[PDB]
Amino acid sequence: DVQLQESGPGLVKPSQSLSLTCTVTGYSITSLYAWNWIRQFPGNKLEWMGYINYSGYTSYNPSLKSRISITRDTSKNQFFLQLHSVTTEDTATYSCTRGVDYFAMDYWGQGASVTVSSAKTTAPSVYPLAPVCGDTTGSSVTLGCLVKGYFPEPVTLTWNSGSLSSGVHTFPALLQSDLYTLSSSVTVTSNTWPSQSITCNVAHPASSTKVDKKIVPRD
Amino acid sequence: IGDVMEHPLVELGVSYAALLSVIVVVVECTMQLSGEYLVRLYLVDLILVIILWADYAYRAYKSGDPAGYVKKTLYEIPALVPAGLLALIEGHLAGLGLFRLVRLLRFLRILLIISRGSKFLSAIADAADKIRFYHLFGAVMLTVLYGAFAIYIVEYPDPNSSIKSVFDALWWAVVTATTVGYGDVVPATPIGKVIGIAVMLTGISALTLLIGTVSNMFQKILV
Amino acid sequence: IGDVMEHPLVELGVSYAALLSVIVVVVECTMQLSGEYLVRLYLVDLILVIILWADYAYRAYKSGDPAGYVKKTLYEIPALVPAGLLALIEGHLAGLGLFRLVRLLRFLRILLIISRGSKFLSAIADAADKIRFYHLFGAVMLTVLYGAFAIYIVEYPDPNSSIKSVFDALWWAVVTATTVGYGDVVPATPIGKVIGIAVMLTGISALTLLIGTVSNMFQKILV
Amino acid sequence: AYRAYKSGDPAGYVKKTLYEIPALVPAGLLALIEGHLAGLGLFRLVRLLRFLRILL
Amino acid sequence: ENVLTQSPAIMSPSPGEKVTMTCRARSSVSSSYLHWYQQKSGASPKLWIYSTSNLASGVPARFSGSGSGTSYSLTISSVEAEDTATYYCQQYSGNPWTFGGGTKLEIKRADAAPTVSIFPPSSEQLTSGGASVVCFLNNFYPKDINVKWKIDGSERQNGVLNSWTDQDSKDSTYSMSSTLTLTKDEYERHNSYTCEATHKTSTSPIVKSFNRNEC
| DSSP collapsed to 3 states, chain A | CCECCCCCCCEECCCCCEEEEEECECCCCCCCCEEEEEEECCCCCEEEEEEEECCCCEEECCCCCCCECCEEECCCCEEEEEECCCCHHHCEEEEEEEECHHHCEEEECCCEEEEECCCCCECCEEEEECCCCCCCCCCEEEEEEEEEEEECCCCEEEEHHHCECCCEEECCCEECCCCEEEEEEEEEECCCCCCCCCEEEEEEHHHCEEEEEECCCCC
Torsion of CA C27, C33, C35, C36, to 10 degrees: 150
On whether both E6 and E102 belong to a single domain, the answer is yes
Interface test with C, best of A12, A13, A17, A68 (most C CBs within 10 A): A17
On whether both E82 and E105 belong to a single domain, the answer is yes
Residue C209 makes CB contacts below 8 A (sequence gap 6+) with B215, B218, B219, B222, C136, C140
Q: Are E163 and A171 in contact (CB under 8 A)?
A: yes
On whether both E98 and E137 belong to a single domain, the answer is no
- Chain A and chain E share a number of CB contacts under 8 A equal to 148
D abuts C (3+ Cβ pairs < 8 Å)? no
On whether both E142 and E166 belong to a single domain, the answer is yes
Interface test with B, best of C21, C151, C207 (most B CBs within 10 A): C21
Q: Are A165 and A182 in contact (CB under 8 A)?
A: no
**d(C-alpha E9, C-alpha E5), whole Å:** 10
On whether both E182 and E105 belong to a single domain, the answer is no
Domains of chain C, each with CATH number or no CATH: 6-223 (1.10.287.70)
Query: Residue A8: its chain C contacts at CB < 8 A?
Result: none
**d(C-alpha E40, C-alpha E172), whole Å:** 13
Q: Which of these three, E109, E127, E152, is where a domain ends?
A: E109
Q: Are B45 and B132 in contact (CB under 8 A)?
A: no
| Count: domains in chain E | 2
Residue C83 makes CB contacts below 8 A (sequence gap 6+) with none
**d(C-alpha B151, C-alpha B188), whole Å:** 11
**d(C-alpha E6, C-alpha E1), whole Å:** 15
One-letter amino acid of E212: R
Cα-based distances in Å from B60 to B53, B64, B70, B126, E184: 10, 7, 8, 22, 84
- Over the range E133-161, which residues count as b (16 or more CB within 10 Å of their CB) and which as e? bbbbbbbbbbeebebbbbbeeeebeeebb
E211: helix, coil or strand? strand
One-letter amino acid of C222: L
Q: Which CATH number fits domain A1-118: 3.40.50.300, 3.30.230.80, 3.90.226.10, 2.60.40.10?
A: 2.60.40.10
**d(C-alpha A134, C-alpha E210), whole Å:** 10
One-letter amino acid of B89: I
Q: Are A53 and B94 in contact (CB under 8 A)?
A: yes
This structure's resolution (angstroms)?
A: 3.2
* Residue B103 to residue A33, Cβ atoms within 8 A: no
How many residues are present in chain D? 56
* Residue A209 to residue D12, Cβ atoms within 8 A: no
Interface test with A, best of E47, E211, E212 (most A CBs within 10 A): E47
DSSP tag of E157: -
State in Å, rounded, how far the first CA of chain D is from the last one.
30
As beta bridge partners, residue E67 has E72
As beta bridge partners, residue A201 has A158, A212
Closest in A55, A59, A73 to B37, CB measured: A73
One-letter amino acid of E157: Q
Q: Is the dihedral of CA C174, C179, C181, C182 positive or negative?
A: negative
**d(C-alpha C160, C-alpha B200), whole Å:** 30
On whether both E32 and E135 belong to a single domain, the answer is no
* Residue B41 to residue A73, Cβ atoms within 8 A: yes
Longest pairwise C-alpha distance within chain D: 46
Q: Which stretch of DSSP H or E encloses residue C132?
A: helix C120-153
Pairing verdict, β E47-50 and E35-39: antiparallel
On whether both E100 and E184 belong to a single domain, the answer is no
Query: Residue C186: its chain B contacts at CB < 8 A?
Result: 182, 184
Q: List the 30-89 stretch of B: residues with Cβ below 8 A of A.
A: 37-38, 41-42
**d(C-alpha E155, C-alpha E177), whole Å:** 18
**d(C-alpha A103, C-alpha B94), whole Å:** 10
Q: CB-based burial of residue A179 (10 Å sphere; 0-12 exposed, 13-18 middle, 19+ buried)?
A: middle
E154: helix, coil or strand? strand
Q: Which of these three, E92, E109, E126, is where a domain ends?
A: E109
Angle (CA) C7-C11-C17 rounded to 5° is 135
Q: Are A51 and A35 in contact (CB under 8 A)?
A: yes
Torsion of CA C71, C74, C78, C84, to 10 degrees: -140
Backbone angles phi, psi at A29, to 5 degrees: -75, -5
Query: Start-end ranges of CATH 2.60.40.10 in chain A?
Result: 1-118, 119-217
Contacts for B102-106 with beta carbons within 8 Å, 24 or more apart?
B102/A32, B103/A32
Q: Are A173 and A124 in contact (CB under 8 A)?
A: no
* Residue B37 to residue A53, Cβ atoms within 8 A: no
Q: Which of these three, E46, E77, E109, is where a domain ends?
A: E109
The CATH number of the domain where E11 resides is what?
A: 2.60.40.10
Q: Are E114 and E206 in contact (CB under 8 A)?
A: yes
**d(C-alpha B113, C-alpha B127), whole Å:** 15
Q: Domain span at residue E201?
A: 110-212
Cα-based distances in Å from C83 to C62, C119, C141: 27, 17, 32
On whether both E130 and E206 belong to a single domain, the answer is yes
On whether both E75 and E146 belong to a single domain, the answer is no
The superfamily in CATH containing domain A119-217 is Immunoglobulins (2.60.40.10)
On whether both E28 and E124 belong to a single domain, the answer is no
Q: Are D33 and D45 in contact (CB under 8 A)?
A: no
